[model samples]
Target: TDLGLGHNGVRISLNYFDGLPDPSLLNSLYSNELKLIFKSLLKRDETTKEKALMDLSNLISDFNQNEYFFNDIFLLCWSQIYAKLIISDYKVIRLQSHQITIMLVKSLRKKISKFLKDFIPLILLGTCELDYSVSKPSLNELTECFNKDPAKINALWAVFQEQLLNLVKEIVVNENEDTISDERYSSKEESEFRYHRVIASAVLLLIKLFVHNKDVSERNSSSLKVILSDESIWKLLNLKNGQNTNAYETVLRLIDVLYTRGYMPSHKNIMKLAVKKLLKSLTHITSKNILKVCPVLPSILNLLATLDDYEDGTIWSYDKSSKEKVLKFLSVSRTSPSPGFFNAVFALYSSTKRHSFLDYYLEWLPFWQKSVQRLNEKGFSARNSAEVLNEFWTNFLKFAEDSSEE
Candidate 1:
């Protein structure tokens, strides 16, 4: 039982020693099968690679269920294999690799934490890919993994934080360096816009991840402050027309996270500037097609409402011009009321107590109510929208009654 002597001249007993599972048993069983799979994975033919990936997935699942620990060679080899496949030129390969990676993480859990340094950067990059089919699922998988084992992920916080900050800086710098063209409809110009769109989406993803991981958020607060303050990041807020709605929304949410975490300064000047820019952008977008901008309207409105809550005085209370802009935007959006639009408007109204708008609300209430009713009768899944509109209407009536009393 005594195999080795310690520095203190005591023999280390086998009974007292606990180490990694013996790899001999599992390796003997699967080594040849794994070699074939690895060989097939390296084949240039798409079908061969696809079949190999599937076989690998099935093998991993079997191992997972049987509680068979992977040997060092299998772990190292698969890590290298997936690294390439995850970023393959073929979307299918990238997707299958992501699926397998998620499965591997599930099977290994904390056991995979040591590989986070290698795996995380690739996953983060995957989450920003132009293809939603790949990016969205990749992001969701990472989010689930982080929530399931924050402590394990936290072990790589220092490297993760540094990489995230560098990623933000790289995006901002690249965006600034690109020369925008005057030809609006040119294919090149359109692709450039799409590139920015991807960048904006990436920024949004990073900010959301930051908000979700409190440990990372707290530790990386100063770095976030620096990144947020960069003129290039703010320039994203001012992209031509409303081309950067997601970027605009991302910045607003970033502000909310910063303010909520008390990372933002209490000085009115900084927030005042941001509020002004947001109002201008919101007004600009609302003047265009409401349907085109509908997706981000709720987020922008909610963020504004939250900001208004943060200040002692409501945002509109001190800024008459901005108040007029917001009212105009609301007035225009009433023509095409949505659940989100109604919900955000209600939040804004409640926060600001804009009594002057009560008459407008009274007049708009019936039209909105009828719109919801028609939507309900049409049976186009407007139940949620109807509920929100009805709630707003009920609150409006109550507010009107109180105003009349006053």
Candidate 2:
């Protein structure tokens, strides 16, 4: 046993299981297949997974890349390997996911926002069922692109909200409130096992979103409340993300305890979901940023906002709640003595493409009449309206001058 150094030559060679086995393999082959499974998932976060897939895919020439062995199968090994790589473990297959995620973005960068409408739902379901093997890698890949292209984050988030609603609905429908115990785990240490999985999954989803999808992130204010609301299970986190009462801290403890030396809770599959990248990235961001700011509330609120619009602004009209939520995020995180926060007014100003009552402030060309009329219509007192417009004019002038210089 030169340890696969020379060749994998023995009764059990590694090369035979390239494609899935026939249904009849359960008698003799399941053990070997199981062995491969263990091997594949080896080293909580192995680098070998990507290397193996890449090497195998490279075995075929470019012409055969998409060629299939069977009708549904691809002709070239690369296609299957790439697809498999897309679905492999985050740690094991992160490189491939990274490659695929990037390729998806590059090929469809113009349509990344559109792609997210479909991709985000699939990613969320992965938490429920997609093995660490595939989902983790895919998420890893997906997340990297969000940073370079922020808009996808919104589609990802919208889908997340919708799915969360669905999940809650399912829970509500399935369980009887009276039968369910009032004695839910009360303390952070006590409920650690119960919510750890949910917290980790949420953290992973969010980290991925933050990395790949910051655009959806902006304007998603109400969602921040919804997404992290599992803490109402605890009753304290309504305060915020890093406060002494931050529900996320308990989640951190769950992560630490599970990954640390001892046996983590059985209900929690910490090993399968060793989302260490999240831990590392989160800890890094939290520690660094925590020092620079009073609290992460501003960024956290920004996180709740969605800048890049998906649905392509496809919907005929905006939902008032959507508009309101966006405004709330903007309103609360404001700076002014009066603090007459009007994120609704602000978001409306920022996003609308169509010029109407708001067109003057919105127009690219000069138009004093329209701007004044629109502002006046929106109920700005004449004095306030003039002042705001003057401020805007001065700012726009500065921006225009800067642009001209550039």
Candidate 3:
């Protein structure tokens, strides 16, 4: 007889003896215990559901000792239950479900491949959840699995492509059109916060796929063609409201990925527009709160340096006004610069063959001097930034002498 179970909106059926290779392997005690747990899981009360989940978690954790029973049950029942729990409305339930699935996937790594299509989309959906505590581990495990086995990504490429594109479109629809608002889009409310997380997660996954598919086939090019063709994707560069740093950083990495993959020459206009927006934003940053943009500024400068490498001239092709604004930002940020910020400056200074960077060097030299003085005054604890600054100064002087000799 088939045991049919349906709870909330989830429905599944397990054949008692039909599908199992050896029906005799199923222990009556384990089977009866799982039936009870499933009943508790389907109950309306939250406490009952949580208790049932804890019990299920314990079973999955100890599956090594009960391999025969678990292999049969997981194939028939627990997989379905875990799938539903992953998308539960309650955050705690979803978090626990994620933990359990991570264990299950590890325990059944060889056996899980056929079911990746069933679970990949659900795992990606979890990545967009508003709670980082839930989303982070979900993303981590998804990434870990893909890294361990590229065929998993290969099998799910279409799923990854479609979901990521839809996510980008969703972000476009949800983004605030009015750039004049004082409140950040992500900080507007809980719903907007969730949308922001969706954007961040989507872009990051897109980057991962792009890197994976880089040299494999024409697939990444086509994927990127569609992505860049969406004008709204470039508008993400304006997500500079400071609080939406994750989304902004991922978008920058997306650009970096494209450039590194040699998409620059083909998508130059879109790339140029994105670069222009980034530079315009840099110009508007005030030094009074340089720390506010510290996390992103390094990425911005590093990208600019990368773009300058592709420019066909002795200097970057950005307008003089834009250059002046960035120069002002660099000059004012000399007071208390972070190590990453210093490295980005050094990277740009050394990478660009332009005359504008000559002006930058004039500003950067004093920034380096002041940084050394501060490092000395602070007595150089084990802080990495201090050590990095000391190393950068030596490199900076060496680069300066090399340039002078040339």
Candidate 4:
């Protein structure tokens, strides 16, 4: 039968179910056939193991269409296959096991969601492999899984978020320098940048899972909390590629999660500086990719609202408990002299040029005006007068008077 050669697995897998076509056929194949191959793959000899792995890889890829058979066989040996790929000394077997996983996940689709916890960390570990080509299936599988329907977030979050976040943190901090390298990326910096660019994509997908799913669980909160506090986040935000890349778009999305969930960073000055760096990048990004910059406004406004100090000066501002930070900042401006934060706000307000902020004024300005309205409705007082308030009022009135005349 030449079991050691060719696609022996293809027909072996097929014949089990095709011959009997019973519910028991799954158990029959898992016990009688797949288990035999699993045993062979675990053998001490690499050549013997390689034949079994090749068969399994081809077998899984072939059986993809038969969903029932595929799932059962997969379930039967999930741990063994994962263990071999992760812990076995044979590099060839490890590579083939990765192939088996990627092929199975591709075929299984949402059915793969159930094993995500156990299997995904294996894939994350795969990214740490010293050989880039050998480890690539892991990266591809992860990117593919996360790119699937966002509905899977519930199934995936509790199991995988922390591992995924830590994988990203490691990549962001350049902890594992042994990742993908290329002749084109001859320098260490170039190689790591290439590696980071891929990791950054996966990182963003995990962020989206957190943001879109919006689970306020401490586990999920901890994921964001770690990311927000870690200074490495700035490196992730700044990552670009050989072409136009927008990892910061996801960073901005992370900020949106913070704003919506009312997450105020413990490290305010650090985060504010991070925010400033992110905002400055948008100035360059706005021309080629303005769409990415728009979603950033609400979050930036929210962040600015939280700030009390700017440069050598300070401005009274909203605390986390305040629902209307933007409005509260306005309350401060009416009385006190303009501080650094307000000056930055004014810079955005005054810029008539084609800036990301300018196009989104309609979207963002109402947030400010509504806050002002809320303060007025509450019969807001003199607040705290600032030197800049005098000029802010004159500018506010001139616009008001001019608009009224028109």
All models, RMSD in angstroms: 11.7, 18.9, 9.3, 16.1
Q: Using TM-score as the measure, what is the rank order of every candidate, best first?
A: 3, 1, 4, 2
**Each candidate: what lDDT?**
0.58, 0.34, 0.59, 0.47
Model 1 gets an lDDT of: 0.58
Q: Write out the backbone clash pairs for model 1.
A: none
Q: Across residues 1-406, which tens digit of lDDT does each residue of candidate 2 receive?
A: 4211011121111121333222333223223433343244332234555454454334322314422311111112122233223333243463443444344444445534433332344345343321355455555556665663656644655546544433332222322222121233234532332233333344544444443333432455445334433322222223323433234443333334332323222222332233322222222333333433223333232222222122233221323234334333333322220112232233333344332312333332333233345555654553555555565455445434523422
Two-way lDDT contest, 2 vs 4, winner: 4
lDDT of 3 at 190: 43
TM-score of model 1 (CA atoms): 0.59
Candidate 1 residue-wise lDDT, 219-275, digit = tens? 656655555555555555664554635566667776787677665454455566666
> What 10-residue stretch in candidate 2 is worst by lDDT?
4-13
- Count of backbone clashes for each model? 0, 25, 0, 10
Return the TM-score for each candidate structure: 0.59, 0.27, 0.63, 0.42
- Candidate 1, superposed: residue stretches over 4 Å from native: 1-118, 128-132, 139-159, 173-187, 213-222, 231-249, 266-273, 314-320, 354-385
Q: Once superposed on the true structure, which residue ranges of model 3 sit more than 4 Å away at CA?
A: 1-93, 97-118, 124-136, 139-187, 215-217, 220-226, 229-244, 313-320, 354-357, 360-382, 402-406
Q: Considering lDDT, where higher is better, how would the candidates rank from best to worst?
A: 3, 1, 4, 2
Higher-scoring candidate on lDDT, 2 or 3: 3
Q: Write the per-residue lDDT of candidate 3 for residues 23-108, one digit (tens) a residue.
A: 23223425677667777765547799999889988988788876665554445455455544653446788888877766766778
Model 2 scores what on Cα lDDT? 0.34
